[PDB]
């Protein structure tokens, strides 16, 4: 499977594909593995159904937790540094990226934020713009690589974040393509000053439409 | 000193603390509940969300009514986590507040200087009557279907309720009853406020502050 | 010492002398609770599991406490041995040996009068059993009836007169209301249902109780 | 063995095979291996009599445990929860499929729900009409595919069920047929608004002997 | 036991160890918060540093407040390491403070013969007015919007200042008037410190020498 | 009564540190000097805690030596796990007052005892002696010239009050302690004496005993 | 609950438990120690070895002070097995028997009827006065240079024992001067004698007992 | 990857390389391991961005807390013994520091590196490094360390050091023309620890880069 | 690495190389091994800087911390015994070699002594007048053994621990021979009754040249 996460100017966007696989076999067709984890911030898990919902529900209940008690979000240094408290309390297996938008940021165009997590839990504040997670995640990075420059918008990151996950799939087999047949598509996430939305599954499929024609 | 005297003394150590401590008004209106209370702090909040269709209220002292504010959000999350959000109720909470200020009551030397408001409002697309409750100092729990006073004098401020209060009354009609029965027994600089706004999809609790309270009293 | 016990005693009867009143009685189908009870949540009478049922009068975060309490116990038994296993008899002995310990290592005692009633398993015929326990850990085998709360001596002289073994529902249901006296907004009331395939516990509430009264 | 569910326009019907073994010997033809554990569910177990029956009991003595503590019961997503938490505590084995009907849900007709778990404990709700567990799960997976259009009712669903579960004893060892000379069939539960109900051993019998019928 | 009775002894006692101490002042001024004490000690500390913004004043028994002084820096370093630095507030302390005087207070045999002031300026580059909190002896906490003393005899300082109280005060100023104020109940007998809010992180600072003498 | 308990706690261990023989400990050219009424070979009022820093106390032994220990063992832990410049007299003086004040406010007994810590520079630095005195409440007070401790003390401390000379040499700061004892025979059969000498380059403790002590006398 | 007053009533107790008890004399002799009491029985012992040049005796209460008697051997032992058999000494034990009569007396319901006598002489070889330590039910330790005396009625043993004391005294004449002092407030069926020998080469504790005690009475 | 610290007249400096690699792949380009830590020290640590930030976050903190607690800060041997007592608790940091308690302000600068079992050493070689190119950038100073005459020529050698390393070890980055991306450094003396500009690493590495070309 | 102890007629000397490698690599080069741990006591270990120091740190604060504690040093044995519970409690490794003089022995110039430690952290006292740990431990003593008929007095002897180091260093590429280019030597302690003292670098330097002329 492949999470991919860039960051575009004022913002950043998370994209998921659906497949799981057993070996061989596709055991998945519909898995979501982004998801909204509070107002700023999403979390997406190169994993199973549950692996990728389980660890967004938990998070998301620290976060809202943390919220209530002390009548403030935590900053977004403190939000990674609870992340980073449970992925390394889970190894002690697929690691989260993060992305998120943060509000106290001095320059609004570069709040947009993607972290990562390594084989031993540590993180990393993604410099480059984009990152990826997952079997496809080499394909991914080395198509975003030569895309990347399109990026000037979220509409153009959203569409480029699309074409990496295509790419993905079109060169892993554990990573699924755009099924036009059942009509399932990757999820996504977009987040900037005005907080974070799914992407209607309507307009990745028409990205991932497009995408298909222009190939063809 | 005696049994029955004992509980005696503890209720009046109780009664004079919360006596003695500023008033708080939570009432049922259109699109919610609403909270407000005279509080001079930016800081040393007395309204609070609790989950996200169950509010909270509290007068008396600081310490032990946050401490218990904390304890409840501890008490809804865990809940949550282990069975599903609609578990958390007002009526659960506000029986779990019951029972924890019961035993202070009993068990430990000093009863807390405290009066608690849970309320509830319905879920999103629901048609649901809000609900209100008063759990006080001994673990009285008590529901009430139109409005809850707590702290300081409260038998002149409940009835210049009874005598301005009207159900299914606007946000802006609501807090003017609201302000005016506080004021008989004050404007953004010494006010907070707080709705359980039934129309927001997951989580009720918006504050009310600044220019845009102004905008409203 | 003996002080200590007679001024607990006293502190205890007095809250549930305080408190609403609660009628549980024996009957054709059955066992039928009836309780004053104005709230719509906060409630007296429970199931604790599939033969037997609980009615309490005093605090309510008291005996919620030990409604709560009894569930735990009767699941955990029921699971570690047989369905059959959880019995009236049985319940009320964990609540009187509960209360009992309350009474003696609490600062305060329970201000509760607890009635568990249990009727016979589907298609068997035993006589309903109901067992009074009080604040002290006190129990009590009643055979007909069981009343608590509030003024106790003008409700339970009423029933004496007017009760009637192998009574039906509906009239069951209203020697009780007119002994407590001595309406469906102050009233709380359900039946242990001996004709239950498994759950006897069922609660006659609205449009449905209006018509028996 | 195997255990197939699947939803049904109304409902969700969950239906099981009979057989144990040991090694390549038959040790029991008459397992129960599906279970009503309310009056919205079922759980199956491709596991032994003892399993099955156990998991099922523990279950429903949770559910039943909440219903009466709080005068209500779990939400559906609080059920799938309980039942997580509880497979998760014995993988500290064979694998549970849950069959629910959620009664809050606003399409009544799509209302019916199938919930399984992964190797690592991990649950999913499916989304693709049916699922299966068990050594002949992929036999009766790929004959529901090819008969699920055929599905519009209880009835034609329970057909679907009987047929896949013969399909995986017809090449599948473990998993066992029909038995005409004793007269043993594949148990199966059928749920839907007015709630969980076991599937009369005769109109199994009845579906088994036309299956068999028609192929000859 | 009586509560009434107990609670009233306990207070008199503490009350009474209070004022037989020496005297301290907090008050608000244009470059953050001031603290002034009346001590003749070299070593022996009444006014400190707590966390970034931070700061710490009291009066009572030393062993008792030098206890507290320590366990609320052990508290604010703890959760600055488990969330981020901005969680720790002089809200937060004090809410502390309040808790564990209140204990104090109810389980041990005599109370804390203390009184706290917990002050927080604004971080670097903000506006935001200081918050000045008084804890005492019983976990009473009141938000002090200007001025806060503790110690000796309160009335006659408390309203010495009520009269000569600028809000932007200077410096120089501010120092005066509370010097001036605490007279009304040099450098060998004073303890002078601020939390400036114009230092990058630490804004606890000590005024001592040289320096202070340049200032009165 | 919690007030009167205090009281009589307070007077207890007055009285049994007033029963006791005397201590004193002044700065002097040197560094700081100890000066015990102690006829016991044995055991001792006066010893080093760590490498500046120097104890001295009056009352009962078996608590004052209880504590001598403890002062001990935690130096040498501070010590290991920081540095050795980390233990000094107003971090040893500090503990001290925490265990007093445990001791006194939780003890069916408070200790009747009266404990100096002694500090002075470390070799080829200069920084004045600090002197430290803590009491049986734990109450801990910076004395900058002399410290008295046990039995009857106003007679003691106001001959020293008239007797005392900063800077003074070891012989001089010898006398003058002696007289300021006797007024509350003293030979070197009943002292015992010593030293935290800043010229020591490590360990400042040393003991005048002996027909060294004579010397001086 | 007074302090003073709890402390007085112990004190009360334990003072006439061991005034009730026989009396026990240990005294400095030309050889060591000399340990002489008044023991009608010829099982349960008064007076022990504890470690090799130190010795116990006791008065009071025998189920008390053989407790003690028992742990003393157990630290003793424990203390020169962990270090070297010269760190164990009449003043750590002494000192030990202090903290412990101590804890015992704030902490435990009923104080110790007892009063111990802890004595040290010099290794072989070597010239040291012996030392001798009282310790009293409250944790008292007092060092004695000539004579100990405990239990019973003290006044007119000690006064005795005063005028007939000398330094240095031989064997016998320091066992009559003892006999005579216990006379004043008895042969071989009432007595408990031994002494510690500094002549002995590492154990120094011996025992009188039989036809060569009635020898040198 | 390669940190390395070398000894000028009164100060230290220390650099690091930025990158971090899963086997042969290039995980990062911008990898930040030199962490100032107090006012007078900084730790460099050659492994991910996480260790060395958590290492350095953890070790701050706990020099901070020492003072607040304290109010003096720990000397320079209490520094290394709560840093000894981190790693043998818990890859291996290098720590650049400077003893404002020194006799001589122009020798005060320190380093200390720890061995594989977390034994610690202060090195008085003049300077030191750690990680995959360590070998290369120990022979590298050997050579050139005769020139370190002050602040800036010390900055030079530590900069031409990482360039040795990244010439010879593939896990060690050399300076990113295309990227505009640099090692980092941290400079101390007697006035406190301070961040090397990004300006002045790039004007060093430019004339490092035409000095061999 | 090397450590050498020998007695001579009054006391007793202690000396070690300054080499520490990390496989083949020359690690250190100014490596002290050999410290003084109270009056009348030196330890060495065959092992890293740290490992060295760590022990000699913590022996050292036990012996004074019983002499602060009891008033009196421990004596020689009690030393010994301490040494031994902190070696088998750091084994459950190099072991450690320690010299000292026992001021209490009857014979002053017998009175020095040599205690070495077994792999399994068993002591022995050493009666033949020398010892050597380490990796040139068997060179040393060899050399020692053909030179130890020359042992006088105190100087004789420091010459011969340091010929010992010499003859280790030439036969053992792990021990550290004198370095003439960057004027390192080995180090070395000296105990006698007027106490332990570290010997001056200049005296090893004079001795190391003496021995390298007269090989040359």
Redesign the interface.
């Given at each position: 499977x492949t999470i991919v996460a860039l960051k575009y100017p004022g913002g950043v966007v998370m994209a998921g594909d659906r497949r799981s696989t057993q070996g061989n076999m596709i055991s998945g067709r519909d898995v979501r593995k982004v998801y909204i984890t509070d107002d700023y911030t999403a979390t997406g898990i190169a994993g199973t159904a549950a692996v990728a919902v389980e660890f967004a529900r938990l998070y998301a209940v620290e976060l809202e937790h943390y919220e209530k008690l002390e009548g403030v979000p935590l900053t977004f240094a403190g939000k990674i540094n609870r992340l980073a408290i449970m992925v390394r309390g889970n190894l002690a297996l697929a690691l989260p990226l993060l992305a998120g938008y943060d509000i106290h940021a001095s320059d609004p165009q570069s709040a947009g934020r993607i972290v990562s997590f390594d084989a031993a839990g540590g993180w990393n504040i993604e410099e480059e713009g984009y990152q990826a997670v997952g079997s496809g995640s080499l394909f991914a990075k080395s198509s975003m690589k030569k895309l990347y420059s399109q990026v000037t918008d979220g509409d153009s990151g959203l569409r480029v974040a699309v074409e990496a996950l295509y790419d993905a799939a079109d060169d892993d087999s554990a990573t699924g393509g755009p099924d036009l047949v059942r009509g399932i598509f990757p999820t996504a996430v977009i987040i900037d000053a005005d907080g974070a939305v799914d992407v209607p599954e309507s307009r990745i499929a028409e990205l991932a439409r497009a995408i298909i024609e222009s190939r063809s | 000193?005696?049994?029955?005297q004992?509980?005696r003394?503890?209720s009046?150590?109780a009664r004079k603390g919360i006596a003695r401590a500023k008033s708080v008004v939570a009432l049922a209106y259109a699109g919610g509940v609403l909270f407000v209370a005279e509080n001079?702090?930016?800081?040393?909040?007395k309204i609070?969300?609790?989950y996200d269709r169950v509010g909270f209220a509290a007068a008396g002292?600081?310490?032990?009514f946050?401490?218990l504010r904390?304890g409840g959000?501890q008490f809804a999350?865990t809940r949550?986590?282990?069975?599903?959000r609609?578990?958390v109720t007002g009526?659960?909470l506000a029986?779990v507040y019951?029972?924890t200020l019961?035993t202070i009551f009993?068990?430990?030397?000093?009863?807390y200087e405290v009066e608690l408001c849970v309320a509830e409002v319905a879920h999103y697309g629901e048609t649901k009557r809000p609900?209100l409750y008063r759990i006080t100092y001994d673990?009285s729990?008590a529901?009430e279907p139109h409005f809850v006073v707590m702290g300081g004098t409260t038998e002149p401020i409940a009835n210049a309720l009874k005598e301005s209060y009207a159900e299914n009354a606007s946000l802006t009609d609501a807090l003017r009853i609201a302000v005016a029965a506080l004021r008989a027994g004050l404007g953004v600089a010494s006010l907070e406020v707080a709705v359980l706004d039934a129309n927001r999809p997951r989580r009720a609790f918006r504050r009310i502050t600044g220019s845009a309270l102004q905008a409203l009293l």
């Open positions: - | 000193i005696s049994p029955e004992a509980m003394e503890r009046e150590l001079p702090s930016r800081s040393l909040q609070s969300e609790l002292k600081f310490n032990e946050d401490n904390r959000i999350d949550g986590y282990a069975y599903d609609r578990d009526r659960q029986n019951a029972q019961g009993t068990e430990q030397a000093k009863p609900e673990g729990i529901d």
